[PDB]
Subunit: 231 residues, 3 copies
């Protein structure tokens, strides 16, 4: 395990996701409100899935070698397995907060699936120049998602409770900033142009992942917006 | 890319799915009705997914070699990845049109999953005679789906709005004819008996795919059946 | 096929799932009640999926070799493909019976996904001692599911119809006993410590699978709890 310099960040990531999972699990024990239960379920599952995939990367299972540029390049494929399930759960948290219509939710989840799926294909593609074609398609799917979060959701939040409108606005802003960093790190890291070494890349993704999951969850689950308006 | 004679049909397929995706995306921009949004979301996602998988076939990612009959046989596995997601979306379009009950929808999607999954296993099976066992099981799942579309849905459409009944009937008929061709092409093509060469097989699937997705979508999204009855 | 001593149990399993599938399919033909249709759909799909995966194991497709302990160890990976889809369907049968809230259903299905997914990783892991780390995480996800079935569902059933409360209690008890045997068989069988040989392991899983699917389904589909209260 320690044979890879990036192991320290995989281990820290595993620990922080594990701790985040346990914290949300305990916190949600005292919850009976049916609406709050939905948000706790979604939000606890996110770091639990990430915990398993960080562990698989730490132990070496979630790593494969991909030939491109005349080299055997270490590619952590387990990231995409994580993201396939956790990024639509994160979007679902946002969509339920603002009572999004079903068509909009399906558009978001579908675009998200395309985003992660094409990122996976790009990560595993052996023809170097083609990796960036997949990156571009994935990034276009991301831009669609960000567009919807701003010009379909923000003006939906404003007709809702003030506490859900303010909580949505904060989580929207956190999401757009954090999620936009992922394609940049991929592009300059070992999957793309290879300018930033894998150990630093792994650190960067770990900070983004913990912030986008445990950070996000801490903000959401401390808000009164997750509860039905009750006396 | 041009090293494979079937590349021209993969390229045309990619282009037509891409163009179809953009057309539906633009067309649905001016839509606020919650019901119509569902149909636009579902129907736009279908060629978008197909676009990505056609591209993966064009670039060579979605192709593998399978030993059977003492030969290395080129198998485009990306078709099944496409179909796994797009065929239940197509069925969902039909089921929502007639306000199908939840049990019926689950039966359809489940049978569809079995249909595509067993087709994939058959496509990748190395014992030649066993490929046709999987083809038979998949075809039985197809026949179940077609049965339900006729003797569970058609008489559901007739108690609904005339515009939804007439639109459903047309899309049902398009679906049954087009979908029934797929097992025949598989059986006589490079996956099955090998009587029709891969380049012609690829052409045939491209015509079926564009018709079943973009053709289907053009009929559906031009109907007033996708809108709630409103003043 | 007969080259593997466990083939007889794979063949019997295939037959019993096939027969169970046909029986439930015929039985549900005379059903119009929308609630009952849901239970028939879910419950018929379960042995149908299991039939396909038992067949893939019989024909040899669903088997791979995994190096650990200095040996090539036969691992039937198709079990996890089965279980990935059938165990959440089984939980859905239980959850719908007691009209579980959406948050609880998502927690169950999510924990179940983690349970099966980590079992799959453990089954395919090449470092022997690490296989048991994945077994432990999977078992913890199982224990969560069993906890919810007892201390979240049982007291939900009691405020419902007596026929649904009594049917739920029986199916809950069947589920907890049968499902708890699976991690034990894995641990002592060819995936784990290797004390029980593969042919006996295969027998054990076949008895558990038929009981947990066809047995379970026979109890559920003969109950009046699956019908809406109607005059
Ligand atoms: C009911 O609605 C609220 C339940 O949501 C909360 C439900 C949770 C989503 C349940 C899912 C967590 C499972 C219990 C997962 C089990 C293994 C976990 C990964 C635990 C890992 C952390 C520990 C090992 C440090
Ligand atoms: C509604 C939304 C969910 C829409 C989803 C959007 C989605 C369509 C976007 C594209 C997804 C698609 C790229 C998934 C591809 C998975 C694939 C990378 C798995 C690895 O297999 C690739 C090659 C080795 O590189 O296998 C070597 C050759 C092997 C023989 C491969 C044969 C097995 C195939 C992988 C079977 C395909 C199954 C499905 C792709 C399962 C989807 C997995 C998940 C990653 C989407
Ligand atoms: C809101 O409900 C309506 C939105 O549906 C319409 C929503 C669409 C389903 C959004 C999904 C499309 C994504 C934007 C996919 C991005 C890449 C596409 C494959 C674009 C490819 C076509 C172009 C490259 C020729
Ligand atoms: C409700 C509905 C959805 C019901 C669904 C119906 C469904 C049950 C029908 C059968 C689906 C099942 C056949 C999927 C099999 C996928 C498999 C072909 C992927 C390729 O792996 C096959 C061999 C190489 O040929 O791998 C070589 C050996 C490797 C070590 C394989 C180990 C990895 C396994 C593939 C893990 C299994 C994961 C699940 C099958 C994911 C499902 C993928 C999708 C195609 C259904
Ligand atoms: C409508 O709601 C009730 C339908 O549920 C019942 C619907 C069923 C879930 C339909 C799914 C079964 C498909 C017809 C599967 C076809 C192949 C089967 C595996 C048949 C195998 C058994 C036989 C070959 C012995
Ligand atoms: C809401 C709930 C559903 C939550 C779900 C919980 C879930 C997160 C729990 C963990 C699931 C995760 C372990 C699935 C891993 C599948 C993996 C074993 C498939 C086989 O690939 C493993 C190695 C060979 O051993 O591939 C060799 C290297 C290859 C290059 C691998 C590259 C292809 C990757 C497999 C692509 C990943 C796609 C997704 C994992 C699809 C999920 C399949 C299913 C088994 C969950
Ligand atoms: C918890 C993990 C999260 C929130 C991950 C988010 C990841 C993305 C938004 C990834 C986006 C990518 C692209 C837009 C193109 C390049 C490849 C990706 C997959 C890194
Ligand atoms: C957009 C793509 C569509 C509508 C594809 C439909 C495909 C089928 C109905 C495929 C059916 C098959 C069988 C019935 C058995 C042989 C294998 C298949 C998968 C080709
Ligand atoms: C129809 C099949 C059923 C009901 C299978 C149930 C399987 C399980 C509950 C498996 C549990 C496992 C663990 C808890 C850890 C070890 C690995 C598994 C996957 C066997
Ligand atoms: C969105 C953030 C992307 C920028 C990442 C900056 C990383 C700077 C680290 C120094 C680069 C290491 C190069 C020498 C090894
Ligand atoms: C459902 C349509 C299946 C029939 C396809 C007919 C294809 C005819 C093309 C000629 C066959 C090529 C054989 C000589 C290369
Ligand atoms: C939950 C049941 C697990 C116990 C399984 C008992 C199997 C006993 C069979 C005898 C073991 C075979 C060892 C000699 C080959
Ligand atoms: C490819 C995996 C996509 C599914 C991820 C799980 C999250 C799905 C959330 C469903 C949202 C509800 C839509 C109506
Ligand atoms: C194996 C992939 C199956 C899922 C495909 C996505 C479409 C699912 C549509 C869900 C229909 C709603 C059922 C209640
Ligand atoms: C990884 C596969 C998980 C999906 C299995 C299919 C069963 C899903 C049942 C959905 C229950 C409804 C939740 C709201
Ligand atoms: C186009 C929608 C406006 C809100 C999205 C902001 C786009 C940020 C760009 C992210 C950088 C990705 C490379
Ligand atoms: C049995 C249901 C009647 C409607 C379905 C028509 C079946 C068409 C056969 C398709 C050919 C597949 C090989
Ligand atoms: C902790 C919840 C109480 C009900 C679950 C009973 C646990 C049975 C243990 C199963 C054995 C697995 C190794
Ligand atoms: C070796 C790099 C070749 C450049 C490929 C860039 C493709 C980016 C596509 C953006 C439309
Ligand atoms: C393919 C990228 C699309 C980003 C711009 C959004 C187009 C308008 C969509 C309106 C729902
Ligand atoms: C080499 C071909 C052997 C014939 C197999 C046909 C099987 C079809 C099954 C239909 C019930
Ligand atoms: C070779 C076996 C080494 C023992 C591993 C047991 C790990 C079990 C983890 C339970 C917390
Ligand atoms: C509760 C702490 C969980 C941390 C387990 C994984 C950390 C890796 C240590 C090497
Ligand atoms: C908008 C046109 C999209 C076409 C891109 C793929 C066509 C392949 C050209 C070689
Ligand atoms: C209807 C009987 C189904 C049995 C088919 C599979 C049994 C395997 C026989 C070798
Ligand atoms: C993006 C950083 C999130 C910070 C989380 C802090 C949570 C405290 C309530
Ligand atoms: C099956 C062929 C479909 C033809 C689509 C034409 C759409 C015009 C409205
Ligand atoms: C766990 C054993 C189940 C027994 C099923 C018998 C069904 C008869 C109604
Ligand atoms: C990591 C366990 C958290 C302890 C409880 C925190 C207050 C709910
Ligand atoms: C008003 C919300 C500001 C949140 C910005 C957080 C940036 C990481
Ligand atoms: C809305 C601001 C987006 C900031 C992008 C930051 C990418 C590192
Ligand atoms: C391909 C872009 C379509 C242009 C608009 C067509 C009329 C909505
Ligand atoms: C009355 C509907 C006829 C549609 C037939 C289309 C055949 C491709
Ligand atoms: C309902 C008519 C079906 C026609 C099947 C055509 C197969 C090529
Ligand atoms: C296996 C076929 C079952 C025959 C009908 C049983 C009574 C519904
Ligand atoms: C009162 C229900 C008892 C069911 C026990 C079944 C054990 C297999
Ligand atoms: C509730 C009793 C569980 C029995 C476990 C049996 C495991 C073989």
């Amino acid at each position: 395990i320690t044979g890879r310099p990036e192991w320290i960040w995989l281990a820290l990531g595993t620990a922080l996701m594990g701790l985040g999972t346990l914290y949300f699990l305990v916190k949600g024990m005292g919850v009976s409100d049916p609406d709050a239960k939905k948000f706790y379920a979604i939000t606890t599952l996110v770091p639990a899935i990430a915990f398993t995939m960080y562990l698989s990367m730490l132990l070496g299972y979630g790593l494969t070698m991909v030939p491109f540029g005349g080299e055997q390049n270490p590619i952590y494929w387990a990231r995409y397995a994580d993201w396939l399930f956790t990024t639509p759960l994160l979007l679902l948290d946002l969509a339920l907060l603002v009572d999004a219509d079903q068509g909009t939710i399906l558009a978001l989840v579908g675009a998200d699936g395309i985003m992660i799926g094409t990122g996976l294909v790009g990560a595993l593609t052996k023809v170097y120049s083609y990796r960036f074609v997949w990156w571009a398609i994935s990034t276009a799917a991301m831009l669609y998602i960000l567009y919807v979060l701003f010009f379909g959701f923000t003006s939906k939040a404003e007709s809702m409770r003030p506490e859900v409108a303010s909580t949505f606005k904060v989580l929207r802003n956190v999401t757009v900033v954090l999620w936009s960093a992922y394609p940049v790190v991929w592009l300059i890291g070992s999957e793309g142009a290879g300018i930033v070494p894998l150990n630093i890349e792994t650190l960067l993704f770990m900070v983004l992942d913990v912030s986008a999951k445990v950070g996000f969850g801490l903000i959401l689950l401390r808000s009164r917006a997750i509860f039905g308006e009750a006396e």
